[PDB]
Symmetry: C3
Subunit: 484 residues, 3 copies
Amino acid sequence: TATLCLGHHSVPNGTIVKTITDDQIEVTNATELVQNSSTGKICNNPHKVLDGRDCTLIDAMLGDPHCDVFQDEKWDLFVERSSAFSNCYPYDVPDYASLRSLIASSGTLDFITESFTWAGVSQNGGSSACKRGPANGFFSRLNWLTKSGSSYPLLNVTMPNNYNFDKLYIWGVHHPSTNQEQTNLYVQASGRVTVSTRRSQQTIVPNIGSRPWVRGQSGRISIYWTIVKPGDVLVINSNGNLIAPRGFFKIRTGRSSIMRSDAPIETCISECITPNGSIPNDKPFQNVNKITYGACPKYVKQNTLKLATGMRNVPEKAIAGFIENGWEGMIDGWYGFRHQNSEGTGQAADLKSTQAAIDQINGKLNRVIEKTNEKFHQIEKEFSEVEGRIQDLEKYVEDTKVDLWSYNAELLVALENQHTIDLTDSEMNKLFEKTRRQLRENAEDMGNGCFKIYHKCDNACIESIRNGTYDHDIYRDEALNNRF
Amino acid sequence: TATLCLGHHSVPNGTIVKTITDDQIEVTNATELVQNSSTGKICNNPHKVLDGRDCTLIDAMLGDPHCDVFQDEKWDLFVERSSAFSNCYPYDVPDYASLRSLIASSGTLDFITESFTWAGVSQNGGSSACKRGPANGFFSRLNWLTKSGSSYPLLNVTMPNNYNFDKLYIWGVHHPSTNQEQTNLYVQASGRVTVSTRRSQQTIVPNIGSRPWVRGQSGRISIYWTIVKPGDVLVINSNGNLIAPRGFFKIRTGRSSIMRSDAPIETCISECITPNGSIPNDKPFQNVNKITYGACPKYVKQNTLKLATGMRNVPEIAGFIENGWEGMIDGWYGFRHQNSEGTGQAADLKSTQAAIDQINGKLNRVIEKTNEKFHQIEKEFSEVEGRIQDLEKYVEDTKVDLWSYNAELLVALENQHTIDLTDSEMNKLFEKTRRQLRENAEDMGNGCFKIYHKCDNACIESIRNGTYDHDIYRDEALNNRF
Amino acid sequence: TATLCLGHHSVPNGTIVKTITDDQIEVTNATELVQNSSTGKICNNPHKVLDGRDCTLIDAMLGDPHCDVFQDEKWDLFVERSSAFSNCYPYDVPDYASLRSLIASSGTLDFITESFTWAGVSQNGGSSACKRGPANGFFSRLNWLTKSGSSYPLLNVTMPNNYNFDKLYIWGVHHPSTNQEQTNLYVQASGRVTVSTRRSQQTIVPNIGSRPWVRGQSGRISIYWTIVKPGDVLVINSNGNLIAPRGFFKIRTGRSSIMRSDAPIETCISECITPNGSIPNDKPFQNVNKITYGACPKYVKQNTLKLATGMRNVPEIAGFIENGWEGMIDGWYGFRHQNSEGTGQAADLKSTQAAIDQINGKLNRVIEKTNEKFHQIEKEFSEVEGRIQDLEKYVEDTKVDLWSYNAELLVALENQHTIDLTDSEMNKLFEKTRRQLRENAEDMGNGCFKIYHKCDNACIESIRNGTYDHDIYRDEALNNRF
Ligand SMILES: *[C@@H]1O[C@H](CO)[C@@H](O[C@@H]2O[C@H](CO)[C@@H](O[C@@H]3O[C@H](CO[C@H]4O[C@H](CO)[C@@H](O)[C@H](O)[C@@H]4O)[C@@H](O)[C@H](O[C@H]4O[C@H](CO)[C@@H](O)[C@H](O)[C@@H]4O)[C@@H]3O)[C@H](O)[C@H]2NC(C)=O)[C@H](O)[C@H]1NC(C)=O
Ligand SMILES: *[C@@H]1O[C@H](CO)[C@@H](O[C@@H]2O[C@H](CO)[C@@H](O[C@@H]3O[C@H](CO[C@H]4O[C@H](CO)[C@@H](O)[C@H](O)[C@@H]4O)[C@@H](O)[C@H](O[C@H]4O[C@H](CO)[C@@H](O)[C@H](O)[C@@H]4O)[C@@H]3O)[C@H](O)[C@H]2NC(C)=O)[C@H](O)[C@H]1NC(C)=O
Ligand SMILES: *[C@@H]1O[C@H](CO)[C@@H](O[C@@H]2O[C@H](CO)[C@@H](O[C@@H]3O[C@H](CO[C@H]4O[C@H](CO)[C@@H](O)[C@H](O)[C@@H]4O)[C@@H](O)[C@H](O[C@H]4O[C@H](CO)[C@@H](O)[C@H](O)[C@@H]4O)[C@@H]3O)[C@H](O)[C@H]2NC(C)=O)[C@H](O)[C@H]1NC(C)=O
Ligand SMILES: CC(=O)N[C@@H]1[C@@H](O)[C@H](O[C@@H]2O[C@H](CO[C@]3(C(=O)O)C[C@H](O)[C@@H](NC(C)=O)[C@H]([C@H](O)[C@H](O)CO)O3)[C@H](O)[C@H](O)[C@H]2O)[C@@H](CO)O[C@H]1O
Ligand SMILES: CC(=O)N[C@@H]1[C@@H](O)[C@H](O[C@@H]2O[C@H](CO[C@]3(C(=O)O)C[C@H](O)[C@@H](NC(C)=O)[C@H]([C@H](O)[C@H](O)CO)O3)[C@H](O)[C@H](O)[C@H]2O)[C@@H](CO)O[C@H]1O
Ligand SMILES: CC(=O)N[C@@H]1[C@@H](O)[C@H](O[C@@H]2O[C@H](CO[C@]3(C(=O)O)C[C@H](O)[C@@H](NC(C)=O)[C@H]([C@H](O)[C@H](O)CO)O3)[C@H](O)[C@H](O)[C@H]2O)[C@@H](CO)O[C@H]1O
Ligand SMILES: *[C@@H]1O[C@H](CO)[C@@H](O[C@@H]2O[C@H](CO)[C@@H](O)[C@H](O)[C@H]2NC(C)=O)[C@H](O)[C@H]1NC(C)=O
Ligand SMILES: *[C@@H]1O[C@H](CO)[C@@H](O[C@@H]2O[C@H](CO)[C@@H](O)[C@H](O)[C@H]2NC(C)=O)[C@H](O)[C@H]1NC(C)=O
Ligand SMILES: *[C@@H]1O[C@H](CO)[C@@H](O[C@@H]2O[C@H](CO)[C@@H](O)[C@H](O)[C@H]2NC(C)=O)[C@H](O)[C@H]1NC(C)=O
Ligand SMILES: *[C@@H]1O[C@H](CO)[C@@H](O)[C@H](O)[C@H]1NC(C)=O
Ligand SMILES: *[C@@H]1O[C@H](CO)[C@@H](O)[C@H](O)[C@H]1NC(C)=O
Ligand SMILES: *[C@@H]1O[C@H](CO)[C@@H](O)[C@H](O)[C@H]1NC(C)=O
């Protein structure tokens, strides 16, 4: 007689993954789905990255003397270092984060100088706190108006928007330290600034008081901004304490943003940038940072997620079959035959089952979750000062999103591993059943996954069984006689 | 001898859907799950849709002269047209969005006139920028108080809340253009308005300065509001530049809202309203607009999602092993027998009924029917603001992405399970038929049985119903087989 | 001859659960996954719970005379009762919620007194609205400065931060009701208060006007705060209307928070606290409240979610084909045999243990055990505000919807897979039993085998254990069959 057995390959080094019904199970191969490291360098392609060096974006916009190399610049991502400082007149911006976000999202620092007429006042003031070389200076985009002689007239100027784009105007108000200083600079005992368009209005009254010395000055300047639509008009009215603008900024809509990072910038290519540095985006999930720019993987809390890419691994213990056994000596494929004949032993592989299993395994996780999400400008996710309600709301939103996506990742990985194991087992069972249906009554199953053939099955007989053309009528009578 | 086969129906045309393990599979029937179109019109039932032709909600509340038809109105949805304009004295409202939102959510414009006594001043001021016919006018819900003769005394009035519902008051402050104008309207050179209750207070100082001309005026008016709880009191203390109220609005709690849409309104019934128009809600997901009012499907980014409702389609006596049966139209499963009398065909009922039962009603065990949402956040903006707009955009983006992922995964899972259950049902029927035929039959290898005894039409029927007796023909089958 | 049958246990009463493909399927055992009840009490272990009684957090911080017990206190959770009240000078806090949340998250009321020097003014002012026994008083942490003699000079003091932690300063501005009161209290007809650091500055000009009487007073006080980082400095400049601070608070970072609740506090141990009371956290989900502190389950909209633990329940020698074994108590899977000597019954250990070990520890593979969340946004509001309240409500509603959907889908998937695994285990046991009997038995159609040779108790036990040798009965069985 003859013996025919079926089995599957196995490997000496297995990987442990988790499924729906198994917490631990060993497979022949698995791949990592979470990116948990970075090179620590920021790549300069294909995005346009502008190193801030020792300048913030607001100080570069205003015209700090040591930030004058940042004039008419453009960027895709602005990188702010933690060593930046300010070296001009002390100032503060009410609603600072909104202005910073607006400038960062605009994506350019194009400035157009306009002709404002201020009559009866002196222009181009300065201070010893803002030194342009040996001489006193000021912000290059602002104009410090002061009295001329002994009079400060009421200022009333206008400027229409005859262009077809929006304009952004940056102006300010000065807070003197004493009444004497106020009257020495601006003749009136109480100034007032009003800047308005046909749809909005802002009016400020300066405050007088002593403040801690910053570069020798105990006064402050408050910075405000205004946007003028096409076909609109701007009117500036004031009788003191005005830091007049010199022009407008072109404001656009685009995919620019700003990021605080201390990582160096090198020469390389990477489509995803994090404060830790650029990371590859070939994996669906990332664990490096939750602040990202470009095409980046989703942030999950888990540091490792193994996706099974092979069948279950069973070690090998008179040949046997796939029942509680593996075939470590099989390298031509996944499933195959092993026949003990009168001539001698042999081994072959089945290609259709292996190809079907691989074609089902390959390309997985591209049917449920998309390739990558492209996000450019978002909310702030790290804070250095306490604020209250809005900071709590932002933290809550971010935490909720992170938790939900982590749960989704874990559940998806478990489901896919379960289905992979199921399909491999089903493929082995289908091969066994097809072989059984081939041998109508010339065979009998021992139970170890092996068939025994009661007639003389030569090598041609085995090969015909493998191909699918074996005929039971030729050996029917002989096998029936041998069985009984 | 005879031959008995089992098979399943097939169709000339089949749809392509996707499962967990298959990129593209073909089935006999499928349904679409995403609603991606609208009629372009808004239905006026069963909700109450109020159309604001040339008026905004704030203009209709304040009493713009051309918005006088919107007095004492009620609505479920207020539709704001893009052609609305203002035709009265220029004004601006700090935190305009909050007042607009709460007025819209209140759902009514009921106004009650109160008896306010202003001693020493002159009431019912007007301006040429707000004409009520040929004569100068003003907002109908506000009172412009100026000097009488040559004096403007200090106003100090009180108004108790003896009812059991909230009161909403709307007042204002006037910002003149010149110091001369300020002195000519109000005797004092610096006005002040203090409106306060027992738990809150607001004080505003008018600011003088030139402004762009709007209908001939360089001044402006700022609008504020106050809510007085039952048992609380209101005190208005002013020195000048006060735009007094004439009464209070009855504010409420409800499910009203406001929408921006240019779609026309026609006569029909629909529970879902979108700015593109009303849409039906017989599908779980939609792709029209993420701003919705009523019982509406969920918004997803995918434009199509197909759900399988039939078996896998396999092109084509033979069995069910890679072989379809185009000639089966009375069911999904059945038998084909080739006998001496002739060929025959019948359909099974238990398996088909089980398949229909397990297929019908899917997507209802997991997801709900619909969700009713009435008032939400704003999702489209016309001006750049900064922090809050960014936060709102972030929240909406997160919600949309998560729901799209959920929809995709659910559709894939249910397609996979439908295919699996159909195949399992077919295999179960074949196994039961084998189990009936104890030793009188043999598996031919293509999904067919070859019977070794005389099995006429009555014998086929006995096999089909489940009363086949193997013992009767056992000896004959054994003699024939061996 | 003999008959061997294979079956599974059934129970007199079962539970109905839902799966992906079945609306209502009865199972032998199920468990509840949603906690929907509480004892109505708050446990004081292991968290430190501080009872606010009739004092709010702001009143305790400021130094209200009836809130003097709460001086220098520490907490993990602060409970604010609904019967709190104020008994001092009327006041208001601009941006009240942020200060309240900051103080609650700081978790301590540790106050350190500093030595300020106010030259030329009178200190320690009081009022009849804030009584300390017979005498008049004020907030214990604030200093009320007025004129001394007939002059109020320009106050300009400084205080540096030489420590290694932040400082929190609380100060105020007084709003007089009349010009005469302003002039009498402070010489200047218009005061001003400026408080600044090297990176921030605030200036408030007091308002003037009448307000509703609160405890005999018609003037108000506004409360502001300033944080000084290490290495910074504070300057207080004022010429009138200053409510001076007496020191600083130590602000920390931790896991403290604040709650509104009326439930009493008893001696018990629990890790989850809700406004309804404490709830156990042994279930993955809960339905009591969406405001929690500590290690608590997740909030879902569903009050019941049943998880299948046993097999499907089938009503009741025969096999497992549409038949149960109500008399089976030794295990889940086993054999029955009818021999010449008599009937019998046994239970298998391998299959039962495999089913138990696969089912035991389930639902822990996907979801995390517990999540610890301490301080979060506000989820209930008493007054309408507008934009921010709408955004917060939207965020919470979105989160609740998403987590409820996740819970539903997870439970359905787990139930389906449990049913499938039990069925597959039974089928595998049947297939192995058939696999032992190569040609000495024939399937009878109801899950039972007809053994065609004399199979005594030893032969049955050999079949059960896996040592059955078919050869020695092969000839006898073959002779019997044909
Ligand atoms: C209201 O109250 C505030 C605070 O009390 C007052 O503000 C102070 O004003 C004084 C002078 O107006 C400031 O003192 C000045 O400080 C300068 C910087 O000091 C720093 O740097 C030095 C050197 O690096 C350090 O040693 C020092 O510790 C500080 O860290 C000094 O450079 C100034 O020097 C002047 O005096 C010396 C005296 O010999 C001369 O040699 C110098 O040439 C120069 O003339 C000066 O000492 C003080 O810093 C301010 N305080 C704060 C906190 O900033 C307001 O003046 C007060 N308002 C009114 C109206 O009086
Ligand atoms: C501070 O600075 C601001 C801005 O610079 C000044 O505001 C200007 O005020 C003047 C009036 O003093 C405004 O001029 C008026 O404009 C009206 C609207 O113009 C539109 O309509 C006309 C006619 O349809 C069009 O031709 C024109 O292109 C506009 O589309 C005019 O209707 C007014 O006409 C009046 O004057 C003429 C003069 O002959 C008379 O014949 C008319 O009958 C009528 O009386 C007038 O021209 C101007 O628009 C304002 N500017 C802005 C930007 O708003 C402040 O006056 C100034 N304040 C101080 C104290 O200096
Ligand atoms: C601007 O307008 C406001 C409001 O119109 C004025 O505020 C009012 O000021 C008066 C004082 O002139 C307040 O009157 C006082 O009210 C106290 C509280 O009343 C409670 O208690 C009484 C009985 O105890 C109840 O009947 C009442 O309903 C309240 O529950 C009274 O206790 C005071 O009593 C004093 O006068 C009586 C006179 O008979 C004496 O018998 C008493 O012993 C005591 O001396 C007093 O009546 C009034 O409450 C204020 N209104 C509000 C709403 O607060 C401003 O004064 C005004 N400003 C200017 C500049 O005109
Ligand atoms: C307006 C002016 O020129 N005033 C002169 C005084 O400043 C001056 O002497 C010295 O002034 C110092 C502060 O002076 C400046 C400064 O910051 O250096 C001088 C700047 O010109 C002035 N800027 C403008 C635009 O006017 C600036 C400003 O007044 C304030 O600083 C704004 O807060 O002040 C410093 O106090 C020295 O200690 C002082 O000696 C006197 C000398 O006689 O002449 C004035 O004309
Ligand atoms: C107070 C008053 O009636 N003053 C008279 C002047 O108005 C008047 O001349 C004309 O004034 C025009 C601006 O006038 C109004 C307006 O806008 O129509 C008149 C309104 O009565 C007044 N409203 C109130 C409540 O006082 C309104 C108000 O002052 C401003 O709109 C506030 O910003 O102004 C316009 O300038 C014409 O060009 C002018 O001729 C003179 C005529 O002699 O008499 C004044 O008594
Ligand atoms: C400043 C002072 O002492 N003024 C005395 C008057 O208050 C006073 O008579 C009674 O004043 C009552 C209001 O008085 C107090 C109060 O609230 O009880 C007195 C407090 O000392 C004072 N607090 C401070 C820090 O100065 C407080 C304050 O002035 C305001 O209330 C703040 O809003 O007022 C009440 O009006 C009685 O009706 C009145 O008789 C007269 C008596 O001659 O003497 C003043 O010195
Ligand atoms: C990427 O950068 C982030 C910066 O936030 C790192 O996260 C910090 O890691 C340090 C190291 O222990 C902790 O002390 C901080 O608390 C972490 N911050 C936060 C917000 O989590 C992160 O470790 C970096 N990752 C890599 C791979 O470099
Ligand atoms: C419903 O109307 C909205 C308008 O708000 C349409 O959305 C715009 O569609 C155009 C064309 O694709 C885009 O260029 C715009 O960017 C869309 N606007 C926004 C805010 O996304 C929407 O396509 C309409 N839907 C249907 C079915 O007609
Ligand atoms: C736990 O406490 C909350 C307190 O809000 C209860 O929720 C309220 O329940 C009543 C009863 O019908 C409703 O009228 C309110 O509208 C509910 N409030 C909110 C904000 O939803 C809740 O029922 C309590 N649960 C238990 C188990 O005691
Ligand atoms: C394991 O799978 C990865 C991709 O899934 C493949 O690149 C690798 O060659 C596989 N390993 C083996 C030993 O086949
Ligand atoms: C496909 O299924 C729908 C219901 O799900 C049914 O109305 C339709 O008739 C089916 N298609 C065919 C061709 O029968
Ligand atoms: C049902 O299962 C629970 C645990 O899952 C167990 O404690 C209980 O005893 C079971 N019920 C029966 C009747 O065995």
